[PDB]
Amino acid sequence: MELITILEKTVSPDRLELEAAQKFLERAAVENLPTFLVELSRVLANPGNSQVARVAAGLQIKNSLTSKDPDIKAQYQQRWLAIDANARREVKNYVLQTLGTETYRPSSASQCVAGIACAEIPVNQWPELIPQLVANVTNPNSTEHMKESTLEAIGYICQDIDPEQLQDKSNEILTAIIQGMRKEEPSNNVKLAATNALLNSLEFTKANFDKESERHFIMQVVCEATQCPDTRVRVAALQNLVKIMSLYYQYMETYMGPALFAITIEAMKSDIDEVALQGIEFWSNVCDEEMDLAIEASEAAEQGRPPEHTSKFYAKGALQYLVPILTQTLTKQDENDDDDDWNPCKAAGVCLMLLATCCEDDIVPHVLPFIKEHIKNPDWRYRDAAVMAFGCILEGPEPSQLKPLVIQAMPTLIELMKDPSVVVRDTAAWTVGRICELLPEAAINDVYLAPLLQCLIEGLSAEPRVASNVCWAFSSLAEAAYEAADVADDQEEPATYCLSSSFELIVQKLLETTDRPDGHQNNLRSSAYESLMEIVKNSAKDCYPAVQKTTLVIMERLQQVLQMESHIQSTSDRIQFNDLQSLLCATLQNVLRKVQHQDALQISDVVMASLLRMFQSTAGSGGVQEDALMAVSTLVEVLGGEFLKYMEAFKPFLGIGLKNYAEYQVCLAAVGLVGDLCRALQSNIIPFCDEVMQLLLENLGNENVHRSVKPQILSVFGDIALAIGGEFKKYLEVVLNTLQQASQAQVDKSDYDMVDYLNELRESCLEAYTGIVQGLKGDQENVHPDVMLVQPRVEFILSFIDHIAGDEDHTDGVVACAAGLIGDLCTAFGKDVLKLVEARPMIHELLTEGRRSKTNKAKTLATWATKELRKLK
Amino acid sequence: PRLSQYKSKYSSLEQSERRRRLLELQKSKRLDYVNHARR
């Protein structure tokens, strides 16, 4: 009937009544979307209607124009732009006019304004928008609601909108935001909305920050805001200071001394946890930026050039005053622990850690004294703090300075493992684990190993929060022991090592831990399996007897879960069966490694048989899960060509994994598996290639596929080409053009989330061409010549390389791949390639850069290629 | 917010470590498979 009546029914607590209402609206939007929106906006815009109907209308509008789904979003945006400009004009008028006329707390108009703006701004279709929003805020006669709802609108636009679209109007946006944050502003609500919008907006105030006049204006408003009496504004302002430090570190030098240091140190000492957390994050974030600057400085030095950005070492300068604040905060442990909850105490530990790795040696002498003062304090809060701080500084300082300190700490640390406080024992295990990780020499000592091992063994039976760190400590100890034994001096793998004596007890104790009923708490079970896994890998040969037993137990468990999965009762059951299967399979990826290949075979056939059964039952019931595919890969690695026996049966399950493109993670694993099948089955994969190749190309048509699938599919094209050689001619044309296009992709660096998808995908392209050029040519030939079909493409591939050489943005993985390709071309097409290569000086420069190593063999490939071009002379 | 850094351990299993490792392995395999085919 009436739109309003329907709208009010959408909030009914009755399922059917809520269904009728929703279907009415659905088909209305299908029968005449333009007229539906206009009517909806009229409801929203009229204060005469009930709050329920206005809010409901706002929701119908917003949902017609956006969605979390990027693809559906862009689609809704285009459906909007195609509507009569006059109808859209009317909707824009009403939505805009609703701002400030809502009694509702959070405005429903803000999100509609943003939804339409995100569509219309990139094509200048709503020139009226910005200047209207700016007027709403700056107008001294505007009500609190008008200003608040508007600032939220601004915020939603900066957040949802394409990043490239909003710089031409940053000047106006900032005028409104800054005006809304001024301290004279009577309403904290307005200040809060304004400050939240600033945060969303910083991404495009680049041109504004480059102007001292404006930069100075912005910093004063944010700093003053950190003094607002409304805690919500204080926190939001600090959040802005943190983001400003990440994007405009270059400009900060004039504000740190005179403002920021004091503001953020005061925030850290605040009794309001929300405030302390922002002060701490500010100084953890400075550590991150400065560690990144040090890498930039270091790389620029090896290039005989000064770095583009320089560090002012603020962490180093602040360190004196940071540490005493942070150690005290470590004293505020939350007695009821929640390994999923964040508080000042935990943030302080991370911050201390980052300071250790940022300022390295400097830090020791500021922390030690607190540690020695409190290591034996009767108050557990201080005893634990002391042990925590000790573990936080084990990475960063020169190991030569830490060793003596760690060795003299062992006796006390071993005792603390038996401390009456569970909180203390939790930290002792972590600190012990981090000693083993970072400074194993202290633990692999003829003095302390025996008693340390006794503590760790007993600790596996302790409470979850303690046993979990103990597990990690054990695996770390195992890795070190293994390495120590076989740096060298014996040959292929080590005959014995310091853990051999108790290897049996450890595995059985770990196998027990895996099975504890409270295993779900504190990530125990996973930690136990990770540890078992890591210790089986890192074991000496005189440990085989224990290794085999453990493998019989793992298969036993795996065989069990697998058949449990052809008889599922519930989606809870469904979920846990896969979680155990996941851990067991991952564990399998190390045991199969590490037996006799003869035995690995008997195990492989048995497991694959069980998985195929699980596949036959499990899925089409939500299946295929991904770790099962990775499980198959390791299984294909062992059976190699002997896997051909299961192809006819596995084939469909390969497909379903390839076809499933919505779960790019499953698809991805399916793609990689195809590559593994190529190297294993080789030529024998031919009779399967059509099906696969067809599914691959299909997927490439595209684009709600994930970014990340394409490069892998391209890489696999190369493998397929290597595996079937001449038989690839069938696909040659379509693939080359696909490569052609993907080569021309050229995202512009102001972004980095693209700079290293560009390289991820470029490398992929190079591996593709390499597999094709080598696939069509030859080993023990009769004559050669399929490759000649690609001959006409040489000019372009070289251009693609030349363009890669100019871009300072080289991943070593790419330089190498590009070098290997050049060498391939020389060996394939010969002395015509020379003229083309000497016509691009940048290619010469690319090879030299590869003749210096990073990595290893980028240098070999670059060395090889340089040689091939030389011999062509 | 950096909860994952609190008492940071290390796992060849969560989601993404075992991806990074599986991919790194398949790529090394690939490269060796290719190099025996160049020289």
From Swiss-Prot, chain A:
Modified residues (N6-acetyllysine): 211, 835, 867
Description of post-translational modifications: Mono-ADP-ribosylated by PARP16.
A Gene Ontology molecular function term of the record: importin-alpha family protein binding
Pfam families in the cross-refs: HEAT_EZ, IBN_N
InterPro entries hit by this protein: ARM-like, ARM-type_fold, Armadillo, HEAT_type_2, Importin-beta_N, Importin_beta
Gene Ontology biological-process entries: astral microtubule organization; establishment of mitotic spindle localization; mitotic chromosome movement towards spindle pole; mitotic metaphase chromosome alignment; mitotic spindle assembly; NLS-bearing protein import into nucleus; positive regulation of cholesterol biosynthetic process; protein import into nucleus
Primary location: cytoplasm
Keyword field contains Disulfide bond: no
Record-listed N-acetylmethionine modification sites: 1
Record key words, sorted: Acetylation, ADP-ribosylation, Cytoplasm, Host-virus interaction, Nucleus, Phosphoprotein, Protein transport, Repeat, Transport
Top-rank lineage group of the source organism: Eukaryota
Region Essential for high affinity interaction with RPL23A: start-end pairs: 286-462
Modified positions (Phosphoserine) in chain numbering: 12
One Gene Ontology term, aspect cellular component: extracellular exosome
Residue segments, region Ran-GTP binding: 334-419
Region (IAB-binding) residue spans: 329-342
Limits of the Importin N-terminal domain: 21-101
Quaternary structure and interacting proteins, as annotated: Forms a complex with an importin alpha subunit. Interacts with XPO1. Forms a heterodimer with IPO7. The KPNB1/IPO7 heterodimer interacts with H1 histone. Interacts with SNUPN. Interacts with H2A, H2B, H3 and H4 histones. Component of an import snRNP complex composed of KPNB1, SNUPN, SMN1 and ZNF259. Component of a nuclear export receptor complex composed of KPNB1, Ran, SNUPN and XPO1. Interacts with SRY. Interacts with PRKCI/atypical protein kinase C iota. Interacts with KPNA2. Interacts with KPNA7. Interacts with SNAI1 (via zinc fingers) and SNAI2 (via zinc fingers).
Family indicated by similarity: Belongs to the importin beta family. Importin beta-1 subfamily.
Official protein name in the record: Importin subunit beta-1
Taxonomic source organism: Homo sapiens
From Swiss-Prot, chain B:
Taxonomic lineage: Eukaryota, Metazoa, Chordata, Craniata, Vertebrata
Effect of residue 2 to A: Abolishes interaction with KPNB1 and m3G-cap U1 snRNP import receptor activity
Record text on subunit structure and interactions: Component of an import snRNP complex composed of KPNB1, SNUPN, SMN1 and ZNF259. Component of a nuclear export receptor complex composed of KPNB1, Ran, SNUPN and XPO1. Found in a trimeric export complex with SNUPN, Ran and XPO1. Interacts (via IBB domain) with KPNB1; the interaction is direct. Interacts with DDX20, IPO7, SMN1, SNRPB and XPO1. Interacts directly with XPO1. Its interaction with XPO1 and binding to m3G-cap U snRNPs appears to be mutually exclusive. Can form homomers.
Family as reported in the entry's similarity comment: Belongs to the snurportin family.
UniProt source species: Homo sapiens
Name of the protein in question: Snurportin-1
Region of interest: Necessary for interaction with KPNB1 and m3G-cap U1 and U5 snRNP import receptor activity: 1-39
Ranges for domain IBB: 1-39
UniProt subcellular location: Nucleus; Cytoplasm
Illness the protein is tied to: Muscular dystrophy, limb-girdle, autosomal recessive 29: An autosomal recessive form of limb girdle muscular dystrophy, a group of genetically heterogeneous muscular disorders that share proximal muscle weakness as the major attribute. Most limb girdle muscular dystrophies present with elevated creatinine kinase and myopathic electromyographic features. Disease is usually progressive to a variable degree, ranging from minor disability to complete inability to ambulate, and can involve the large proximal muscles, as well as axial and facial muscles.
Biological function: Functions as an U snRNP-specific nuclear import adapter. Involved in the trimethylguanosine (m3G)-cap-dependent nuclear import of U snRNPs. Binds specifically to the terminal m3G-cap U snRNAs.
Span covered, complete protein: 26 to 64 of 360
